[PDB]
Design a protein around this ligand. Structure first.
Ligand SMILES: NC(=O)c1ccc[n+]([C@@H]2O[C@H](COP(=O)([O-])OP(=O)(O)OC[C@H]3O[C@@H](n4cnc5c(N)ncnc54)[C@H](O)[C@@H]3O)[C@@H](O)[C@H]2O)c1
Ligand SMILES: NC(=O)c1ccc[n+]([C@@H]2O[C@H](COP(=O)([O-])OP(=O)(O)OC[C@H]3O[C@@H](n4cnc5c(N)ncnc54)[C@H](O)[C@@H]3O)[C@@H](O)[C@H]2O)c1
Ligand SMILES: [Cl-]
Ligand SMILES: [Fe+3]
Ligand SMILES: [Fe+3]
Lengths: 382, 382
C-alpha cells in the first residue's frame, strides 16, 4: 500500500522562533487565543515570553494553566470548558507533551462534541471535523507533540494511559525554539531527551517504516545522540540542536508508529506517575535486545550515528554496540538503570504486561510480543 | 534569525498513492475539481488514471489541458478563465512543473484578483489570501512543484522566465506515485531527474541553508544519485525511488533557495525553449566549480553519497570528485555536454547573463556573481 505523511503545514525553528507568532496569528486573522499550559510554566515566566509579545502586538489571549503531568480526562474536560467560554478563536499550546496533548484533545472535542467522553478518541479517533486551529510551542526536548498527529490522555478512573491518533490534531503552525526550553532542569532535559531518542529508534524499526521515515529517524538519532549530553550539561547551543532533533523524530514516528518501549512505558505512567522520559529510558535498551534480530542492518546505523565505530563489526557485534551506546547514554545523563529505582512493583508486572500488550504503540514493534514476553521484559528491566 | 519551514500538511507516497485521492476530497467535502493539465498527459491515458477513480467514487470534475511546457501568462489567464466558469471547488494538478506551476498561479489569482496580470506576483508575492485548495499529482522525476511554495511563469512579451514565491501557493495534499511517472520517455526521466539533483545540490549550498534543510538535501542527493540511472534505463523500482528523492529535495530548497544554476537556466528557457532539466544539467557542474571554494565540507558529502570514495581526499580533491560525479551522470544519462548542442547562441550570452543576474534564484548562490562572471560561465558552458 501507499504511505501517507502528515506534517505541520508551517513550522518555525531556532532561538526566537516565538517572535514569528504574532504575525502568523495576524496573517490568518485570528481574534482570541486560549493558552493551554502548566502553572509551573506561567510562574517561571515562560508563558510571559509569548503573552508579552502578543500584548505588544495587540493580540487577545486568555489562559488555562490547569494541565498537570500526565493529563487526565478531567483536565481535558476542564480545558474544553475554559475554551468554550472565551470567544477564543484558536489555542496556543505552550509546554511539553502534557499541555500540548491536552490542547489537541480540547481542539478536537470542541469540533467533534460527539466525543465528549474522551475514551472514544483512542486509536484512530473517527473525527469528521479538523480541530480548532492550534499553535504548538514546545518547551521540552522530547514529545515532538508539535508535529505528531497523536495525543495520549490518562483515564485516572481506569488507571491506564490511552493513545489517540488523528490527522485532525496537527497544528497549523509549530514554533520550535530552545529559548522556551532553556528552563528545563538537567533531569528534565535528560528525560525528554531520551524520550525523543526512544521515539527516533522505535520509528526507525517500527513496522510501517520506509524510505522517508527511515531517513528522518536516523538523522534525528544522530542529532539527539550528539547533543543530549551537552544540553543536559547546559550548553545552550546543544539545546538548540536537541530542540530540532526531537522535532525531526516526530516527523517520522508520527506517520509510522513506535513499539513496545512506549507500549511498556505508558502503563508505567498510569501506574506510578513515572515520567515517560525516564520510563522509556529504562526499558529502551532491554526492548532493543528483544528486537535486535528483527531489525536487519538497522542497529548498525544506530550504533554508527552514536559514535560507535561499527567498522568491521559483525551484525551481531553492531547490534550490541547499539544497545550498549544507549545504556551508556542513560548513565551519562543521570537516568536510573532499573525500574525498581523508580518504584515499580513486581506484583504489578502481570498487570502492566497486560496494559502494555494492549497499548496501541505495541502493535508497531518489529517483533510480536506475548504477555509473557513482556512480563519477562518488565522483570529483566526491574 | 529563525528558519521557517513550509511543507504539505498532507502527502501520499508510493505506487498507487493516487488511489487515496478520492477519499481526501471526501474527508474534506469539496464539491468540484478543475483538472489543470496537458493534452499529452490526457492522450496518454494518464489523467484517466485519476478521472476514472473520481468518476467511480462519484466525484465531479472539469478539465483544462491548455498548459504547455514553460507556461505563459496567457496560459495562466486562460486557465483562471476556465476555472472561473466551472463550479470548481478546488483544483487538481496532474503533470510536471508546468501544469502544476500553472495551477498554483490560477489558485492564487482566483483569490487575489489583485494580480490578474502575473508579473505582479514575482518574488515574494504579496498575496493576502491563501490559494484555492490544490491537490498536486506529479508526473515527473523533478520539479517537486507539489511541495515547493513557488511557481515560475513565462512572460512571452518580456521574454524572461520569472519566479513567483508565496506560502499561499502550497497544495493542501500531494500525491506522489511513480505510476503517474512511468510514462516519461528516458530523455524526460533524465532531464527532470537531473533537475531534481540540481535542486538538491543548490539547496544544499544555498545561503539560507541550515541543519534540517542540509539533512533533507543530502538525503535527496543520495537517493537521486543512486537511482536516476536505473530509472532512465527502465527500472520501475528505481522510478519509485526517484519519485521520492525529487519530492524530498523540494522539502528543502523550497524553504531556503537555490543559486546560479537555476538563475542561469531560466533565461535559457525563455530564450531557446531549452528544457529546464537539460539547461540545469549542462550548467550545474560548471556552476559547481565557480562555487566549490564557498561550500565548506559540502562537496565532500556530495561526492560520497554519489559513490565517490572521498576517503583519502583533500577538500580540493573531494570538491573535484563532486563536480566530476555530476559530469559523469549527465553523460550516463544522455544529456548533451554543451549549451552549443542545445542551440544557445554566443551573441546572446550578454543578454542571458543579465537575465540570470536578475533572476530571483541567483541571490541564493553561495558566491556572489557579477554579470561578467556569469558571462564567463555561459561561455565556459557553451
Ligand atoms: N504517544 C506517544 O508517542 C507519546 C510520545 C511522547 C510523549 N507522550 C506523552 O507526553 C507527555 C510528556 O510530556 P513532557 O515530557 O514534556 O512533560 P510534561 O509537560 O508532562 O511535564 C513536564 C514537567 O516539567 C515542567 N516543564 C515543562 N517544560 C519546561 C521547561 N521548558 N522549563 C522548565 N520546566 C518545564 C512542567 O511544568 C511539568 O511539571 C506524557 O503525557 C506522555 O505520555 C506520548
Ligand atoms: N522554481 C523552480 O524551482 C523550478 C524547478 C523545476 C522546474 N521549474 C519549471 O517547471 C517546468 C518543468 O516542468 P517539467 O519539466 O517537469 O515538465 P512539464 O510538465 O513542464 O512538461 C513536460 C513535457 O513532458 C510531458 N510529460 C510530463 N509527464 C509525462 C509523463 N509521465 N509521461 C510522458 N510524458 C510526460 C508533458 O506532456 C510535457 O510535454 C518548467 O516550465 C520549468 O521552468 C521551476
Ligand atoms: Cl476579550
Ligand atoms: Fe514518548
Ligand atoms: Fe528546477
Amino acid at each position: 500500500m501507499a504511505n501517507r505523511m502528515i506534517l505541520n503545514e508551517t513550522a518555525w525553528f531556532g532561538r526566537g522562533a516565538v517572535g514569528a507568532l504574532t504575525d502568523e496569528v495576524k496573517r490568518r486573522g485570528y481574534q482570541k487565543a486560549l493558552i493551554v499550559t502548566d502553572k509551573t510554566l506561567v510562574q517561571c515566566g515562560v508563558v510571559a515570553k509569548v503573552t508579552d509579545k502578543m500584548d505588544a502586538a495587540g493580540l487577545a489571549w486568555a489562559i488555562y494553566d490547569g494541565v498537570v503531568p500526565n493529563p487526565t480526562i478531567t483536565v481535558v474536560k476542564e480545558g474544553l470548558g475554559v475554551f468554550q467560554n472565551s470567544g477564543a478563536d484558536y489555542l496556543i499550546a505552550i509546554g511539553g507533551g502534557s499541555p500540548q496533548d491536552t490542547c489537541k484533545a480540547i481542539g478536537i472535542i470542541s469540533n467533534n462534541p460527539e466525543f465528549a467522553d474522551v475514551r472514544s478518541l483512542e486509536g484512530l479517533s473517527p473525527t469528521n471535523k479538523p480541530s480548532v486551529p492550534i499553535l504548538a510551542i514546545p518547551t521540552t526536548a522530547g514529545t515532538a507533540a508539535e508535529v505528531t498527529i497523536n495525543y495520549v490522555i490518562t483515564d485516572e478512573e481506569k488507571r491506564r494511559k490511552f493513545v489517540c491518533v488523528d490527522p485532525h490534531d496537527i497544528p497549523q503552525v509549530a514554533f520550535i525554539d530552545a529559548d522556551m526550553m532553556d528552563g528545563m532542569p538537567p533531569a528534565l532535559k535528560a528525560a525528554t531527551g531520551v524520550d525523543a531518542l526512544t521515539h527516533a529508534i522505535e520509528g526507525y524499526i517500527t513496522r510501517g517504516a520506509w524510505a522517508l521515515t527511515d531517513a528522518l529517524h536516523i538523522k534525528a538519532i544522530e542529532i539527539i545522540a550528539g547533543a543530549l549530553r551537552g544540553s543536559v550539561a547546559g550548553d545552550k547551543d546543544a539545546g538548540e540542536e536537541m530542540a530540532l532533533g526531537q522535532y525531526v523524530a516526530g516527523m517520522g514516528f508520527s506517520n509510522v508508529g513506535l513499539g513496545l518501549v512506549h507500549g511498556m512505558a505508558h502503563p508505567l505512567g498510569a501506574f506510578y506517575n513515572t515520567p515517560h522520559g525516564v520510563a522509556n529510558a529504562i526499558l529502551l535498551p532491554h526492548v532493543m535486545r528483544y528486537n535486535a534480530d528483527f531489525t536487519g542492518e538497522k542497529y548498525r546505523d544506530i550504533a554508527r550515528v552514536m559514535g560507535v565505530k561499527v567498522e568491521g563489526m559483525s551484525l551481531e557485534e553492531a547490534r550490541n554496540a547499539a544497545v550498549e551506546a544507549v545504556f551508556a547514554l542513560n548513565r551519562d545523563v543521570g537516568i536510573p538503570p532499573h525500574l525498581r529505582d523508580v518504584g515499580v512493583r513486581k506484583e504489578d508486572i502481570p498487570a502492566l504486561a497486560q496494559a502494555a500488550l494492549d497499548d496501541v504503540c505495541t502493535g508497531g514493534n518489529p517483533r510480536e510480543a506475548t504477555l509473557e514476553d513482556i512480563v519477562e521484559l518488565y522483570h529483566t528491566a526491574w
